[PDB]
Amino acid sequence: ELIKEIMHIKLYMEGTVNNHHFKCTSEGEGKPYEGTQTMRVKVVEGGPLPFAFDILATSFSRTFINHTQGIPDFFKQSFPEGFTWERVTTYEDGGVLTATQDTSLQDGCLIYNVKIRGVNFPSNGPVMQKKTLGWEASTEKLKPADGGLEGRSDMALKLVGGGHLICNFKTTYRSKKPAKNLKMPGVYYVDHRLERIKEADKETYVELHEVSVARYPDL
């Protein structure tokens, strides 16, 4: 089957956000066919992060997406090799977070390897002052873009005692399997819900849950 009904995950992440180098590590598990998953994150380097963790949570699983209707799963079809993704998130206040990700399948446990580069996050802004809450539920429009998938989405980051700091991202998904060995999907949508379950000792340990359900557009 390759991708089982319940799958284990292990993650490695490192980066610099406003030149503040850090390193993160994770262990998680989800139901790939149901679109749910859970991730327990631990910041191993760069002490208590000077920026809001929320900018990183969104880089911590395309393989855990409930493909309803009968949409070809580009992500699951890409195994055992896996797939890569490059995302660029642009914030309304000038902050830009670029992330590079590698997904592989080694000895049953699913492996994620992320690279993070955050720049121009304003000093007294919600991210740097750590005055952000969760991410509101978002929707990503995916369209087949020459061999891979291109995903665009507009997100809203909840703010401490306020409204939101909005942003948008452009992502490119590249399969490790050749495009010849893949049945590509049409233009489809993925609705996401990203909730933070737990938090410990100054955003050093964070538990996150995600729910993703794919669907063909309405008529």
Author numbering: 7 to 66, 70 to 228
Pull verbatim passages from the article behind this deposition.
To understand the effect of mutations introduced during mTagFT’s development on its blue-to-red timer properties, we determined the crystal structure of the mTagFT red form with 2.9 Å resolution. mTagFT has a typical β-barrel overall structure with the chromophore formed by 65LYG67 amino acids located in the central α-helix. There are four protein subunits per asymmetric unit with very similar folds (RMSD does not exceed 0.4 Å2), which do not form any stable oligomeric states according to crystal contact analysis. Despite the crystal twinning and relatively low resolution of the structure, it was possible to identify chromophore molecules in all four subunits of the asymmetric unit. There was a lack of electron density around the tyrosine moiety of the chromophores, probably reflecting their flexibility and/or poor crystal quality. Unlike the Fast-FT blue-to-red fluorescent timer, mTagFT has an intact chromophore without clear signs of covalent bond cleavage and contains serine residues in the 148 and 168 positions (enumeration follows to Figure 1) near the phenolic hydroxyl of the chromophore. Hence, biochemical data support the formation of the trans-chromophore in the mTagFT protein. All four chromophore molecules have similar coordinations in the protein, involving four direct hydrogen bonds to R69, W94, R96, and E222. Taking into account an absence of the IF2 interface in mTagFT, this indicates the effective destruction of this interface due to the M151K, Y153K, and C229P mutations. Notably, the crystal structure of mTagFT does not have a canonical IF1 interface; instead, there is another weak interface (approximately 7 HB/SB), with one disulfide bond made by C118, of two adjacent subunits, where the N11I mutation is located. Therefore, mTagFT contained three mutations, M65L, Q220L, and A224S, that might be associated with its blue-to-red timer properties.
